[PDB]
Amino acid sequence: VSVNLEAFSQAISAIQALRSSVSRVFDCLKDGMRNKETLEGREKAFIAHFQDNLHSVNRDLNELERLSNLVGKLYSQLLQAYKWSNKLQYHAGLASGLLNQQSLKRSANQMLVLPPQYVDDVISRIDRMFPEMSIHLSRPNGTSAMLLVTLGKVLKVIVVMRSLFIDRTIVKGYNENVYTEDGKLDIWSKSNYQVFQKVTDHATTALLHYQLPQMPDVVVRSFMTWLRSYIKLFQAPCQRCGKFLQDGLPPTWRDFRTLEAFHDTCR
Amino acid sequence: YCIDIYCRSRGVVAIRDGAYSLFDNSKLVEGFYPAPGLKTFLNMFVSWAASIPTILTHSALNILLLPSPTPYLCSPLERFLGSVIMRRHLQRIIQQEQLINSNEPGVIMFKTDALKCRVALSPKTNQTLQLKVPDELQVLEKFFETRVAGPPFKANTLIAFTKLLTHILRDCVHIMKLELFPNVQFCLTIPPSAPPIAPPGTPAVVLKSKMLFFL
Amino acid sequence: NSIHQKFHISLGTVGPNSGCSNCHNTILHQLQEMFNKTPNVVQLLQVLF
Amino acid sequence: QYLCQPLLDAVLANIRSPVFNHSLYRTFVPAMTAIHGPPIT
Amino acid sequence: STLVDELESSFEACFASLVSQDQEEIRTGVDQCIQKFLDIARQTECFFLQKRLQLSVQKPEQVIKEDVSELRNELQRKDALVQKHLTKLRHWQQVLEDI
Amino acid sequence: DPVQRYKMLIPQLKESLQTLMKVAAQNLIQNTNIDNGQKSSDGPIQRFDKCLEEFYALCDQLELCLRLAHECLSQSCDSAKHLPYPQYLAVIKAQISCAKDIHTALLDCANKVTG
Amino acid sequence: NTASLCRIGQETVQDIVYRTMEIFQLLRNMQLGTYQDRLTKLQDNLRQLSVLFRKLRLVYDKCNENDPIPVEQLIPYVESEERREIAEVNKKLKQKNQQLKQIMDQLRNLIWDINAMLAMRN
Numbered sequence: 001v002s003v004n005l006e007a008f009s010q011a012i013s014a015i016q017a018l019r020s021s022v023s024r025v026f027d028c029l030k031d032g033m034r035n036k037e038t039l040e041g042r043e044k045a046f047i048a049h050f051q052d053n054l055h056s057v058n059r060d061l062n063e064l065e066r067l068s069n070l071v072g073k074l075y076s077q078l079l080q081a082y083k084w085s086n087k088l089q090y091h092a093g094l095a096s097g098l099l100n101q102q103s104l105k106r107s108a109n110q111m112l113v114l115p116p117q118y119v120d121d122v123i124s125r126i127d128r129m130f131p132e133m134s135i136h137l138s139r140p141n142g143t144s145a146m147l148l149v150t151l152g153k154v155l156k157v158i159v160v161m162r163s164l165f166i167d168r169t170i171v172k173g174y175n176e177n178v179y180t181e182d183g184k185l186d187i188w189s190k191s192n193y194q195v196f197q198k199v200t201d202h203a204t205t206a207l208l209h210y211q212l213p214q215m216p217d218v219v220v221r222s223f224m225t226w227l228r229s230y231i232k233l234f235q236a237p238c239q240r241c242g243k244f245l246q247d248g249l250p251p252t253w254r255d256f257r258t259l260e261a262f263h264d265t266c267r
Numbered sequence: 268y269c270i271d272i273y274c275r276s277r278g279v280v281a282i283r284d285g286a287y288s289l290f291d292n293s294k295l296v297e298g299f300y301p302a303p304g305l306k307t308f309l310n311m312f313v314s315w316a317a318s319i320p321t322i323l324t325h326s327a328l329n330i331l332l333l334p335s336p337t338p339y340l341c342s343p344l345e346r347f348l349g350s351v352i353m354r355r356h357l358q359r360i361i362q363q364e365q366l367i368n369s370n371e372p373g374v375i376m377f378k379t380d381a382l383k384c385r386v387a388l389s390p391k392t393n394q395t396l397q398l399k400v401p402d403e404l405q406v407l408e409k410f411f412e413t414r415v416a417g418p419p420f421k422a423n424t425l426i427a428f429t430k431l432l433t434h435i436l437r438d439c440v441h442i443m444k445l446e447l448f449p450n451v452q453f454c455l456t457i458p459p460s461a462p463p464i465a466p467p468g469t470p471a472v473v474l475k476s477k478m479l480f481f482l
Numbered sequence: 483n484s485i486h487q488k489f490h491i492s493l494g495t496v497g498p499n500s501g502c503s504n505c506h507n508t509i510l511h512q513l514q515e516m517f518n519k520t521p522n523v524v525q526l527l528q529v530l531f
Numbered sequence: 532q533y534l535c536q537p538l539l540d541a542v543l544a545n546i547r548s549p550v551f552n553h554s555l556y557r558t559f560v561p562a563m564t565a566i567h568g569p570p571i572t
Numbered sequence: 573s574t575l576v577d578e579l580e581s582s583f584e585a586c587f588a589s590l591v592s593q594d595q596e597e598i599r600t601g602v603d604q605c606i607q608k609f610l611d612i613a614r615q616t617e618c619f620f621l622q623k624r625l626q627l628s629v630q631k632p633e634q635v636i637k638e639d640v641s642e643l644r645n646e647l648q649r650k651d652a653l654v655q656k657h658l659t660k661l662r663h664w665q666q667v668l669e670d671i
Numbered sequence: 672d673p674v675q676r677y678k679m680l681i682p683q684l685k686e687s688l689q690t691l692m693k694v695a696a697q698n699l700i701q702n703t704n705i706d707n708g709q710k711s712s713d714g715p716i717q718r719f720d721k722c723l724e725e726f727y728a729l730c731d732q733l734e735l736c737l738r739l740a741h742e743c744l745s746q747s748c749d750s751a752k753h754l755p756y757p758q759y760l761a762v763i764k765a766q767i768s769c770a771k772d773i774h775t776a777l778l779d780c781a782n783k784v785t786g
Numbered sequence: 787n788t789a790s791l792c793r794i795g796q797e798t799v800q801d802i803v804y805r806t807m808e809i810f811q812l813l814r815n816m817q818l819g820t821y822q823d824r825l826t827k828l829q830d831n832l833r834q835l836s837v838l839f840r841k842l843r844l845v846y847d848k849c850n851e852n853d854p855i856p857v858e859q860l861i862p863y864v865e866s867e868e869r870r871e872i873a874e875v876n877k878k879l880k881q882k883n884q885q886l887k888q889i890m891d892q893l894r895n896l897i898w899d900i901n902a903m904l905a906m907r908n
């Protein structure tokens with residue numbers, strides 16, 4: 001356990017700060033006087049500093065017991081070869097660096113085929129968690145995969161891929177026939193809802209926002225992570241206007257890199 | 268055991284005893300048993316009088332604190348502790364249960380049978396103690412110097428060697444001369460000597476630490 | 483640092499000439515305490531020297 | 532704030548005294564300079 | 573003058589964070605090397621902006637040499653594809669009479 | 672063992688500071704009365720330097736309860752991080768070979784750069 | 787010609803800069819038999835890095851061999867038969883662009899024919 005082993009740090013610092021502060025109380029009163037020209041700038045500062053250091057000792061004493069309340073509670077030769085592997089984890093963090101994703105790219109101008117089973121292995125990696133959502137991969141038309149996604153009791157989404165990249169994505173509710181009369185997945189239709197049609201535009205702006213020229217897996221992973229915030233729809237008020245409805249519209253627009261529900265007017 | 272270091276300008280360091288008390292000679296520290304003889308080990312670089320902070324010019328602390336080959340790459344400081352920590356606790360071995368009989372300033376004589384030995388601090392290198400006790404006797408202390416007083420310096424290996432120490436010495440030294448020519452297992456003369464095979468060895472397991480004999 | 487009303491002196495290795503780390507941080511909580519007393523840069527510089 | 536009134540009462544009793552800086556010195560100086568350490572170089 | 577040298581001086585400083593024999597030094601060390609290294613690089617651009625604007629205005633011929641150079645290299649790659657396209661055009665010929 | 676031994680040091684420490692400041696206040700009046708002109712027999716002088724034996728040692732017996740615990744929460748946890756002993760004997764020498772290989776590869780790249 | 791060499795020097799500076807970020811991108815992928823491939827990859831990368839370093843030193847000397855005329859002549863103040871070739875080939879390449887434009891327009895008609903085929907195929 002480490003909650004007590006790190007909560008002890010404040011108390012073990014506070015007792016030494018008590019020793020140092022009472023030493024200050026002793027020697028500052030033992031320092032005598034430093035007039036610095038006028039006496040009224042000293043003798044009125046005498047009671048000021050005498051209150052200051054004594055009250056510092058007092059507040060240190062006081063904050064000692066609120067930390068004390070929250071806390072609770074071959075022989076040494078082979079011990080040395082144990083923690084070095086644990087500090088090798090820090091050594092892994094030694095060469096990380098904070099440069100991360102950001103680079104200094106210029107223009108990319110000078111002077112392919114992948115199996116659908118690779119797409120299936122891609123979709124199997126992230127479907128394994130988030131059990132409230134489901135993924136149903138299908139290719140009734142060509143090698144391109146379009147997927148049915150159910151979101152608890154809320155949303156039914158068709159997500160069309162092509163050429164291993166993104167093609168389209170249309171979201172509807174939970175009580176509609178997303179299939180056709182023949183039973184195939186619907187391709188060209190409309191969600192028949194003002195809020196859903198409004199947020200499909202946000203989805204189209206988001207798919208053109210996540211731009212990786214080589215790595216579309218993180219593009220679609222960030223897309224579905226963004227979509228995961230939309231299971232909180234009709235349940236969270238807007239962050240700037242307080243109320244849900246802006247002209248009758250609840251907040252939906254999650255901002256880029258900061259996922260919280262907004263409107264177009266609410267930015 | 269404790270160390271005091273007091274830095275100062277122009278490369279000056281004041282070296283106190285640490286384990287002493289500055290102020291009380293009637294009273295000391297409970298957990299830090301006092302550490303004598305420290306200044307002599309300082310003065311070669313150059314009772315309760317080692318409690319002074321000793322001026323050094325930031326340069327003998329180099330050779331003292333540096334891990335150096337043992338005269339394992341163990342420092343003259345930590346070797347000297349090992350010479351000390353054997354010297355403290357061998358006494359605490361000898362006084363209990365065996366026969367204790369010695370008369371010297373700091374040297375200790377264990378008056379048992381089979382060439383009772385007397386051990387003092389070595390003068391050329393104080394970092395190791397030196398024991399004084401036919402020709403196969405002397406190899407035992409060099410093995411004791413290299414291994415039982417090995418620079419890991421843990422206490423319980425002395426428990427075996429103190430309890431380790433007649434004709435049993437004759438075979439084991441033949442095994443000891445053999446082992447020195449090329450551990451946790453000693454030898455005994457159930458037979459007359461130690462041949463190349465079938466010796467009545469005396470081992471000691473780490474997890475057991477019991478009197479082990481194999482024949 | 484205004485909400486601290488303090489200074490957060492960072493003891494740090496610079497240049498390709500060192501061993502494992504900066505290693506001045508044993509006295510880290512102690513060097514901060516002394517400059518509570520003093521607004522004098524030489525007090526910091528000379529203790530290092 | 533709690534159990535500090537001897538320290539508060541000592542300074543008001545010892546105020547308007549000409550031996551103030553020496554009375555406090557006499558009653559206090561050996562306690563901190565002995566155990567906690569010597570003065571600086 | 574010798575601007576590559578102080579540029580490549582910051583190169584081994586970029587290795588100072590990497591090669592040796594509590595985090596705050598690392599964030600500073602990887603920063604000020606890089607920010608001076610982008611400092612030492614962007615000025616070479618402006619130095620190169622100086623050097624070929626010198627060549628741009630002091631003479632008009634190296635402008636039109638490189639203008640011909642880019643269009644000839646466009647002239648080939650234009651021609652490189654069209655009879656490639658034509659050979660390709662010949663490809664779906666027999667692809668389509670398979671029925 | 673030390674989990675219940677810590678539970679008595681801290682409440683003893685709080686009152687150790689209390690009796691420390693109480694004997695300090697006992698010394699304060701007795702020593703201020705000597706300085707100015709007024710007479711009072713010291714009797715039980717109750718000198719403070721003995722009482723300081725009680726508190727700092729209780730701050731030290733705290734650390735003996737913590738630092739040994741700092742050892743006690745470490746040694747048993749990482750004793751068997753990586754049941755068959757010879758497999759472990761093989762993987763420790765393999766990993767200590769590879770760690771030195773990457774350690775000298777870092778210096779190999781550094782020496783390829785300069786030096 | 788020398789302006790092309792200065793452009794080459796600028797692009798090789800960009801090459802070393804991109805080389806630096808690609809080294810930092812590649813090395814950050816490994817922390818503590820898969821290890822051998824990454825180290826061989828980085829060895830080839832640093833070999834190409836050294837080759838690029840020496841070739842930028844070569845082209846830096848090549849661009850620095852010729853400069854007497856200084857800067858501040860460069861600020862634009864308000865106060866032979868190759869040109870015939872340029873003028874004649876500009877409209878030829880424009881005519882080629884238009885000639886392929888009618889062809890791709892015919893292909894546009896073809897693709898507007900073909901997208902209605904699958905539209906009502908069923």
Ligand SMILES: [Zn+2]
Pocket residue numbers: 238239240241242243244246251262263266
């Ligand atoms: Zn809103």
